[PDB]
Amino acid sequence: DPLSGLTDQERTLLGLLSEGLTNKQIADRMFLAEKTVKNYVSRLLAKLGMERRTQAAVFATELKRSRPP
Template structure:
């Protein structure tokens, strides 16, 4: 990656689940769309000056303690998280398989793994789990 390129993730996705992924992927900042937009430019200036800017409530647990249950989505692989997001949007296994260029069987396997990891007994509960975590604001 070119050292002159500085990446700030600007998203509506929850920081508790995605900020760490952004950091691991090389981003230097994370800004959620529910924050005051007037704060985006100062954050970008800090990133350009060489600082990493991430939500404090997201990084403190990463630095000081293992992930807790409320951050369980952060423990999922990127592919599992993608499948879960598509499931939460109401897509069928076939539709997800077509989008990800995978087989229906592979999506079914991801679904089973997600149910095991998230400790839910019905596929419908995966959608509820995803939306429940998405609303968590870390406060």
């Protein structure tokens, strides 16, 4: 059984992408290197079957309202 859903960091990453933060800004909030965030965004997009940041951001937005935490 692979980790097919989102980890806690991936959920946070989704939320921060929806604020329009760049990888460097995200990294600054997560205490990570920018290259790590870039790699995490790539994995997250791949998992979700999307190619672009904006798609993930739109999916995050729709999720916040369709199924609030």
